[PDB]
Amino acid sequence: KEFECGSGECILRAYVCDHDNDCEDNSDERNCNYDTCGGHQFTCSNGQCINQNWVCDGDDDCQDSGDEDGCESNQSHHRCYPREWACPGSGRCISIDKVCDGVPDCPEGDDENNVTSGRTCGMGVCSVLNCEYQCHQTPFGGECFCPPGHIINSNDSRTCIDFDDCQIWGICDQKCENRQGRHQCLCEEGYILERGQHCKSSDSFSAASVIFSNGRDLLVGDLHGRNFRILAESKNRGMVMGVDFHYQKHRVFWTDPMQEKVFSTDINGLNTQEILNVSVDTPENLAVDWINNKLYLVETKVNRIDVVNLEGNQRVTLITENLGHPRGIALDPTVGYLFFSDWGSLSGQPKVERAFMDGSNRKDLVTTKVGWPAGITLDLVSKRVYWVDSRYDYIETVTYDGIQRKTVARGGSLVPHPFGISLFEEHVFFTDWTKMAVMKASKFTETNPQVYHQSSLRPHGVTVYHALRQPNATNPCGSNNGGCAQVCVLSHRTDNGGLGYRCKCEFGFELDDDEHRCVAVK
Amino acid sequence: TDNDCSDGSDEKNCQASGTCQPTQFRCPDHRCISPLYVCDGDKDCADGSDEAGCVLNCTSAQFKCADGSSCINSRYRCDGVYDCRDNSDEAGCPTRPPGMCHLDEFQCQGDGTCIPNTWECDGHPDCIHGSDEHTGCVPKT
Numbered sequence: 001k002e003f004e005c006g007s008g009e010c011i012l013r014a015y016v017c018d019h020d021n022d023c024e025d026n027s028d029e030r031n032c033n034y035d036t037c038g039g040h041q042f043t044c045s046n047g048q049c050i051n052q053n054w055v056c057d058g059d060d061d062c063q064d065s066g067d068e069d070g071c072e073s074n075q076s077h078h079r080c081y082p083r084e085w086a087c088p089g090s091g092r093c094i095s096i097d098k099v100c101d102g103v104p105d106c107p108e109g110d111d112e113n114n115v116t117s118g119r120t121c122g123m124g125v126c127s128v129l130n131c132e133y134q135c136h137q138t139p140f141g142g143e144c145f146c147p148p149g150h151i152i153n154s155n156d157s158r159t160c161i162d163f164d165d166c167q168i169w170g171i172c173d174q175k176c177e178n179r180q181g182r183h184q185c186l187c188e189e190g191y192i193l194e195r196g197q198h199c200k201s202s203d204s205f206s207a208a209s210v211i212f213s214n215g216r217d218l219l220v221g222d223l224h225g226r227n228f229r230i231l232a233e234s235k236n237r238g239m240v241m242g243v244d245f246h247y248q249k250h251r252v253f254w255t256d257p258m259q260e261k262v263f264s265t266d267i268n269g270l271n272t273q274e275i276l277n278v279s280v281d282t283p284e285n286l287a288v289d290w291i292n293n294k295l296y297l298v299e300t301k302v303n304r305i306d307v308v309n310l311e312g313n314q315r316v317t318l319i320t321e322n323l324g325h326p327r328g329i330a331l332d333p334t335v336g337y338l339f340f341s342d343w344g345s346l347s348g349q350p351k352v353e354r355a356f357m358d359g360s361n362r363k364d365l366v367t368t369k370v371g372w373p374a375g376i377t378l379d380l381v382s383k384r385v386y387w388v389d390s391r392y393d394y395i396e397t398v399t400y401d402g403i404q405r406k407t408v409a410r411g412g413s414l415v416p417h418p419f420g421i422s423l424f425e426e427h428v429f430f431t432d433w434t435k436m437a438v439m440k441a442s443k444f445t446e447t448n449p450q451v452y453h454q455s456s457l458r459p460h461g462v463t464v465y466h467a468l469r470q471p472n473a474t475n476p477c478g479s480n481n482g483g484c485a486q487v488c489v490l491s492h493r494t495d496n497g498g499l500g501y502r503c504k505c506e507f508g509f510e511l512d513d514d515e516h517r518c519v520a521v522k
Numbered sequence: 523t524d525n526d527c528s529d530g531s532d533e534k535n536c537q538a539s540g541t542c543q544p545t546q547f548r549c550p551d552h553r554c555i556s557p558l559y560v561c562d563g564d565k566d567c568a569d570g571s572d573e574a575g576c577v578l579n580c581t582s583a584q585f586k587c588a589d590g591s592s593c594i595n596s597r598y599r600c601d602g603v604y605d606c607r608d609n610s611d612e613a614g615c616p617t618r619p620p621g622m623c624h625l626d627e628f629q630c631q632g633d634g635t636c637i638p639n640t641w642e643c644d645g646h647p648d649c650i651h652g653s654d655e656h657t658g659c660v661p662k663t
């Protein structure tokens with residue numbers, strides 16, 4: 001009936017071959033099917049697949065806590081980091097190069113002499129510690145400091161053990177391996193490594209430019225702001241609202257809430273034409289599926305998320321359930337997810353939502369301490385999402401599965417009212433409604449964002465015009481419209497039995513039982 | 523951190539010194555905030571410091587949910603709609619005594635249904651057999 005182990009024990013079939021050792025002989029664990037998880041599942045360290053909703057809910061389902069890793073917004077450090085010191089007050093970490101240098105380099109300013117404590121900076125008992133690498137001055141006296149790949153052991157300050165520097169935030173901008181030199185950076189194809197840390201775009205691509213809304217018109221400039229060119233000027237008291245592009249066809253799209261229309265143009269400002277002017281009334285934001293030739297649109301008069309082709313003909317609504325106040329949208333067609341934000345639903349909950357590129361399998365990617373989430377951008381090479389918040393005033397990042405939440409900026413002085421955001425290589429460009437300027441920000445950690453272009457009006461959605469921002473991938477719907485009768489909307493690579501697409505029908509039709517042929521709605 | 527002036531003049535020279543005005547409440551490391559947002563049922567600070575630890579209050583024109591989760595307007599008390607999460611509003615509402623009608627209602631002798639007193643003897647038979655326009659009704663000169 002059931003499965004009997006080699007050691008003489010009965011185990012249920014469901015729990016036979018499920019990464020559970022069961023009998024000490026591990027009879028049920030010698031065979032390995034354990035196929036790769038689908039789009040709707042999270043993959044634990046040990047290969048077990050669990051549903052996406054189980055991630056960061058409070059239960060260690062993975063048995064390795066892989067699905068409960070850093071769900072909090074980096075409230076405090078974990079034993080700080082090697083060659084760094086911990087400020088007791090707020091968990092900020094600074095290195096010895098700043099500790100006792102004479103300047104208060106963390107909010108509490110405990111790293112210097114204080115009249116209320118009597119702590120003085122200098123040498124001390126470190127002569128007795130005899131640290132593995134070196135001693136240095138701290139307000140408690142001499143203390144241990146150790147090189148890269150050297151962290152102090154369990155309650156043993158004198159002893160340094162080898163550490164994995166690959167886990168530290170921002171050690172390498174794209175990729176890192178720890179098998180040589182205690183760590184080593186590397187870059188995705190198309191990028192070229194500069195120095196030993198930073199990967200920059202190869203000069204084999206034409207150029208890189210940033211496109212943003214001045215609040216009235218559509219601007220464009222270089223990555224340093226030496227020269228700015230007005231791309232397309234708004235007519236009839238218009239307003240450029242949300243912008244996105246398509247590098248293959250050299251077209252730039254932008255929405256207009258005041259004119260209640262959506263436009264598109266060449267990068268040269270030629271052939272400006274109206275894409276949609278029906279039922280589109282307040283298009284907050286926009287996105288383009290660059291490999292399927294689609295334009296995903298956000299609407300807020302009737303809260304919904306649409307998809308229409310680049311020329312604006314085939315239309316179908318994807319998300320309508322409990323959509324509340326949709327503001328942000330981003331997508332990764334290569335893998336096949338759709339990310340969108342929501343600063344208040346029909347249920348009171350604000351959230352940052354994840355979905356398939358056809359609206360299936362919606363998930364709360366980020367739910368706690370989310371306030372007023374705004375536009376979203378993706379790190380296409382490191383598989384992370386970046387979203388900004390206007391209520392709690394921060395810029396945060398989580399992976400595609402919502403794990404490992406890290407804050408890159410925070411405070412009313414830093415990012416008082418962000419709206420839009422975009423990544424290129426190492427910088428997040430984010431619009432801010434309070435300082436009234438498009439600001440350039442480092443994507444790991446920032447003490448202070450630089451001003452990139454200071455406007456007289458509230459700026460809006462920003463994007464970075466570059467080829468590497470739109471990596472190549474095959475088109476599942478390329479094989480004769482994917483066999484669909486009317487519309488082929490791309491989905492997850494693992495959806496539809498690996499076909500990677502789901503058929504849809506334009507308004508006025510519904511899918512038959514074949515899910516391929518459209519029939520007139522009754 | 524709100525651009526009220528529409529030109530950013532009310533947000534210029536804002537600094538992290540944590541020295542807000544006496545009127546404005548201070549979130550610990552987030553921003554200053556107006557009193558009208560302290561204890562208002564909404565977490566306006568990052569950590570909810572402005573909402574935690576406070577208690578609800580009500581005028582004579584409002585009603586308390588049993589669990590203290592809201593102060594609803596008195597108009598919504600005894601309306602047929604559950605407003606409070608714990609249904610504290612529609613509990614204990616006046617019940618029409620078995621098979622009779624309230625003091626404000628005439629009862630149709632033909633079927634037992636109730637109509638307001640204002641419809642008794644008004645010239646229009648509202649009840650299904652014209653019970654409400656009985657011969658005892660005073661004639662209108």
Ligand SMILES: *[C@@H]1O[C@H](CO)[C@@H](O[C@@H]2O[C@H](CO)[C@@H](O[C@@H]3O[C@H](CO)[C@@H](O)[C@H](O)[C@@H]3O)[C@H](O)[C@H]2NC(C)=O)[C@H](O)[C@H]1NC(C)=O
Pocket residue numbers: 190467468469470471472
């Ligand atoms: C995605 O794939 C497309 C198509 O393979 C890439 O576009 C093409 O990239 C090649 C370079 O590998 C370009 O060739 C170069 O063109 C310039 C201009 O004519 C010429 O001076 C060079 O000598 C070289 O021949 C090509 O023009 C370009 N365009 C097309 C439509 O073929 C694209 O770069 C890929 N993008 C990524 C991010 O992988």
Ligand SMILES: *[C@@H]1O[C@H](CO)[C@@H](O)[C@H](O)[C@H]1NC(C)=O
Pocket residue numbers: 154155156
């Ligand atoms: C200190 O570290 C040693 C390392 O072997 C460990 O056995 C011990 O439990 C630790 N004690 C405390 C209190 O952390």
Ligand SMILES: *[C@@H]1O[C@H](CO)[C@@H](O)[C@H](O)[C@H]1NC(C)=O
Pocket residue numbers: 274276277
């Ligand atoms: C919408 O655009 C089409 C194509 O340019 C045009 O024929 C039509 O009149 C427009 N309608 C409105 C209301 O602008």
Ligand SMILES: *[C@@H]1O[C@H](CO)[C@@H](O)[C@H](O)[C@H]1NC(C)=O
Pocket residue numbers: 579580581
């Ligand atoms: C509010 O609370 C006080 C008690 O602290 C009470 O005396 C007062 O009548 C209440 N006022 C309002 C407007 O509800």
Ligand SMILES: *[C@H]1O[C@H](CO)[C@H](O)[C@H](O)[C@H]1NC(C)=O
Pocket residue numbers: 035036037038494498
């Ligand atoms: C893993 O299985 C998934 C479905 O659960 C996909 O088929 C995926 O392509 C598989 N991965 C590999 C490497 O075959």
Ligand SMILES: *[C@H]1O[C@H](CO)[C@H](O)[C@H](O)[C@H]1NC(C)=O
Pocket residue numbers: 540541542543
């Ligand atoms: C902060 O600056 C304000 C400006 O009005 C007041 O001068 C205040 O006394 C200062 N200090 C503190 C602790 O708030």
Ligand SMILES: *[C@H]1O[C@H](CO)[C@H](O)[C@H](O)[C@H]1NC(C)=O
Pocket residue numbers: 616617618619620
């Ligand atoms: C409703 O409850 C009240 C309690 O005071 C009265 O008893 C009234 O007569 C009840 N009517 C019914 C039908 O339950």
Ligand SMILES: *[C@H]1O[C@H](CO)[C@H](O)[C@H](O)[C@H]1NC(C)=O
Pocket residue numbers: 662663
């Ligand atoms: C009719 O006349 C009587 C007196 O006979 C009363 O005055 C009565 O008020 C009159 N009707 C109306 C509608 O006023």
Ligand SMILES: [Ca+2]
Pocket residue numbers: 015016017018019020021022028029
């Ligand atoms: Ca098992």
Ligand SMILES: [Ca+2]
Pocket residue numbers: 054055056057058059060061067068
């Ligand atoms: Ca879990």
Ligand SMILES: [Ca+2]
Pocket residue numbers: 098099100101102103104105111112
């Ligand atoms: Ca210092």
Ligand SMILES: [Ca+2]
Pocket residue numbers: 390391392393416417523524
């Ligand atoms: Ca704000």
Ligand SMILES: [Ca+2]
Pocket residue numbers: 559560561562563564565566567572573
């Ligand atoms: Ca509040």
Ligand SMILES: [Ca+2]
Pocket residue numbers: 598599600601602603604605606611612
């Ligand atoms: Ca009620």
Ligand SMILES: [Ca+2]
Pocket residue numbers: 641642643644645646647648649654655
């Ligand atoms: Ca009557």
